[PDB]
Enzyme design. Structure first.
Site, PDB file in Angstrom:
ATOM      1  N   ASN A   1      -1.529  -9.726   4.311  1.00 23.77           N
ATOM      2  CA  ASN A   1      -1.419  -8.302   4.580  1.00 23.77           C
ATOM      3  C   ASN A   1      -1.074  -7.596   3.260  1.00 23.77           C
ATOM      4  O   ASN A   1      -0.864  -8.243   2.219  1.00 23.77           O
ATOM      5  CB  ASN A   1      -0.323  -8.050   5.643  1.00 23.77           C
ATOM      6  CG  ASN A   1      -0.401  -6.650   6.263  1.00 23.77           C
ATOM      7  OD1 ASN A   1      -1.338  -5.869   6.003  1.00 23.77           O
ATOM      8  ND2 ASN A   1       0.581  -6.342   7.112  1.00 23.77           N
TER       9      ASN A   1
ATOM     10  N   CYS B   1      -5.604   0.042   3.309  1.00 25.08           N
ATOM     11  CA  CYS B   1      -5.678  -1.404   3.615  1.00 25.08           C
ATOM     12  C   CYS B   1      -7.087  -1.959   3.379  1.00 25.08           C
ATOM     13  O   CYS B   1      -7.248  -3.084   2.891  1.00 25.08           O
ATOM     14  CB  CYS B   1      -5.236  -1.690   5.057  1.00 25.08           C
ATOM     15  SG  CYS B   1      -6.058  -0.587   6.278  1.00 25.08           S
TER      16      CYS B   1
ATOM     17  N   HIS C   1      -6.714  -1.857  11.130  1.00 25.96           N
ATOM     18  CA  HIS C   1      -6.042  -2.344   9.915  1.00 25.96           C
ATOM     19  C   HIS C   1      -6.840  -3.450   9.250  1.00 25.96           C
ATOM     20  O   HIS C   1      -7.249  -4.385   9.929  1.00 25.96           O
ATOM     21  CB  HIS C   1      -4.668  -2.872  10.309  1.00 25.96           C
ATOM     22  CG  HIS C   1      -3.838  -3.305   9.156  1.00 25.96           C
ATOM     23  ND1 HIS C   1      -3.700  -2.541   8.011  1.00 25.96           N
ATOM     24  CD2 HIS C   1      -3.106  -4.421   8.952  1.00 25.96           C
ATOM     25  CE1 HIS C   1      -2.923  -3.176   7.156  1.00 25.96           C
ATOM     26  NE2 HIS C   1      -2.543  -4.317   7.703  1.00 25.96           N
TER      27      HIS C   1
ATOM     28  N   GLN D   1       0.781  -1.249   0.000  1.00 28.63           N
ATOM     29  CA  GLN D   1       0.000   0.000   0.000  1.00 28.63           C
ATOM     30  C   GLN D   1       0.810   1.295   0.000  1.00 28.63           C
ATOM     31  O   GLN D   1       0.265   2.379  -0.254  1.00 28.63           O
ATOM     32  CB  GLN D   1      -1.037   0.023   1.131  1.00 28.63           C
ATOM     33  CG  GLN D   1      -0.587  -0.469   2.419  1.00 28.63           C
ATOM     34  CD  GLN D   1      -1.761  -0.637   3.398  1.00 28.63           C
ATOM     35  OE1 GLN D   1      -2.194  -1.761   3.680  1.00 28.63           O
ATOM     36  NE2 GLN D   1      -2.235   0.471   3.944  1.00 28.63           N
TER      37      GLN D   1
HETATM   38  C1  LIG Z   1      10.529  -3.128  -1.939  1.00 26.29           C
HETATM   39  C2  LIG Z   1       9.352  -2.169  -1.763  1.00 26.29           C
HETATM   40  C3  LIG Z   1       8.839  -1.648  -0.553  1.00 26.29           C
HETATM   41  S1  LIG Z   1       9.491  -2.020   1.119  1.00 26.29           S
HETATM   42  O1  LIG Z   1      10.213  -3.341   1.092  1.00 26.29           O
HETATM   43  O2  LIG Z   1      10.462  -0.925   1.507  1.00 26.29           O
HETATM   44  O3  LIG Z   1       8.351  -2.051   2.107  1.00 26.29           O
HETATM   45  O4  LIG Z   1       7.778  -0.821  -0.825  1.00 26.29           O
HETATM   46  C4  LIG Z   1       7.603  -0.805  -2.197  1.00 26.29           C
HETATM   47  C5  LIG Z   1       8.535  -1.607  -2.780  1.00 26.29           C
HETATM   48  C6  LIG Z   1       8.535  -1.741  -4.266  1.00 26.29           C
HETATM   49  O5  LIG Z   1       9.349  -2.447  -4.857  1.00 26.29           O
HETATM   50  C7  LIG Z   1       7.470  -0.957  -5.047  1.00 26.29           C
HETATM   51  O6  LIG Z   1       7.486  -1.082  -6.271  1.00 26.29           O
HETATM   52  C8  LIG Z   1       6.496  -0.111  -4.316  1.00 26.29           C
HETATM   53  C9  LIG Z   1       6.577  -0.046  -2.890  1.00 26.29           C
HETATM   54  C10 LIG Z   1       5.666   0.746  -2.201  1.00 26.29           C
HETATM   55  C11 LIG Z   1       4.694   1.468  -2.846  1.00 26.29           C
HETATM   56  C12 LIG Z   1       4.597   1.421  -4.225  1.00 26.29           C
HETATM   57  C13 LIG Z   1       5.488   0.638  -4.983  1.00 26.29           C
HETATM   58  C14 LIG Z   1       5.386   0.583  -6.495  1.00 26.29           C
HETATM   59  C15 LIG Z   1       4.210   1.349  -7.111  1.00 26.29           C
HETATM   60  C16 LIG Z   1       3.850   2.596  -6.318  1.00 26.29           C
HETATM   61  C17 LIG Z   1       3.489   2.249  -4.881  1.00 26.29           C
HETATM   62  C18 LIG Z   1       3.304   3.562  -4.083  1.00 26.29           C
HETATM   63  C19 LIG Z   1       2.170   1.468  -4.879  1.00 26.29           C
END
Ligand SMILES: Cc1c(S(=O)(=O)O)oc2c1C(=O)C(=O)c1c-2ccc2c1CCCC2(C)C
Ligand SMILES: Cc1c(S(=O)(=O)O)oc2c1C(=O)C(=O)c1c-2ccc2c1CCCC2(C)C
Ligand SMILES: Cc1c(S(=O)(=O)O)oc2c1C(=O)C(=O)c1c-2ccc2c1CCCC2(C)C
Ligand SMILES: Cc1c(S(=O)(=O)O)oc2c1C(=O)C(=O)c1c-2ccc2c1CCCC2(C)C
Length: 215
Positions: A182, A25, A162, A19
């Site tokens: 999740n 969520c 959540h 998310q």
């Molecule tokens: C690794 C990782 C982590 S994390 O491991 O640091 O939690 O969070 C993300 C990644 C990704 O690889 C990723 O592509 C991503 C993430 C979080 C939000 C998004 C995207 C791609 C589209 C835009 C949105 C905002 C939906």
């Protein structure tokens, strides 16, 4: 009911999503339950669009939170929800861009599990498929979950903050659990999943706000 069920093994569950920072969520939970019903009714498994719900469920609060029931009602009244491919998730609220040509699933409303009733929730998961549930996920122990059947003595069954997806249930070394999908990406929890204590006095409020869409 069987003693264990896991929809992930049955091809009813899409991969774990992220998310971002958005409190969407409830939209991922809703979409996961819809995806399960779409597979059961049509044999197709496809990613549906939580962004469609964040943007268009006008009485929910976008990245500020929302009820899954209102999302199912929106999909029903709108006569459709878009696929992820047709309405991609961007992790912020936008104006509603629902496009009927991208429609990938429909819904005939929803059903709520009786409040606090884990036996009814188990029945629903066994008979219907993945069920949307709300839990208290505010604790340090939840953020840092790795393995095992999650149980924190301080979980507050009235602090439903959540939304997640119950995709099954089972037992690990004698400890009964719910199998929970999740939406905090694969790097959280056990590849994005958590096993949460089952039949432990409605731990974390698991059965306080459970619902599923009808299809
Ligand atoms: C690794 C990782 C982590 S994390 O491991 O640091 O939690 O969070 C993300 C990644 C990704 O690889 C990723 O592509 C991503 C993430 C979080 C939000 C998004 C995207 C791609 C589209 C835009 C949105 C905002 C939906
Ligand atoms: C069948 C069917 C399909 S469809 O899936 O066959 O294209 O789309 C719709 C229907 C309906 O029966 C229906 O009432 C409806 C639909 C689409 C939008 C609306 C409404 C009723 C209120 C106004 C709005 C604009 C919300
Ligand atoms: C959308 C939609 C669908 S459906 O598209 O999911 O089939 O079914 C219904 C709706 C409504 O919006 C609605 O108000 C409704 C429906 C079905 C029965 C009724 C009512 C309201 C008054 C009378 C009763 C209670 C019999
Ligand atoms: C989370 C989670 C849980 S569980 O603890 O939530 O039930 O079980 C599994 C996961 C995985 O992420 C996973 O990759 C996995 C799991 C179980 C068996 C397998 C695999 C990957 C290769 C094939 C085999 C059959 C070895």
């Amino acid at each position: 009911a069987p003693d264990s069920v896991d929809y992930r093994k049955k091809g009813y569950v899409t991969p774990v999503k992220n998310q971002g920072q958005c409190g969407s969520c409830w939209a991922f939970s809703s979409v996961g339950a819809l995806e399960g019903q779409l597979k059961k009714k049509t044999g197709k498994l496809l990613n549906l669009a939580p962004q469609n719900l964040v943007d268009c469920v006008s009485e929910n609060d976008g990245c500020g939170g929302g009820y899954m029931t209102n999302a199912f009602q929106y999909v029903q009244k709108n006569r459709g929800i878009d696929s992820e491919d047709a309405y991609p998730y961007v992790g912020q609220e936008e104006s509603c861009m629902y496009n009927p040509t991208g429609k990938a699933a429909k819904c005939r409303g929803y059903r709520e599990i009786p409040e606090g009733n884990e036996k009814a929730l188990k029945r629903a998961v066994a008979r219907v498929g993945p069920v949307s549930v709300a839990i208290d996920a505010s604790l340090t122990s939840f953020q840092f979950y790795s393995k095992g059947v999650y149980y924190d003595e301080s979980c507050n069954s009235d602090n439903l903050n959540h939304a997640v997806l119950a995709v099954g249930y089972g037992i690990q070394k004698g400890n009964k659990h719910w199998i929970i999908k999740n939406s905090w990406g694969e790097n959280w929890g056990n590849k994005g999943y958590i096993l949460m204590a089952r039949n432990k006095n409605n731990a974390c409020g698991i059965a306080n706000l459970a619902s599923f869409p009808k299809m």
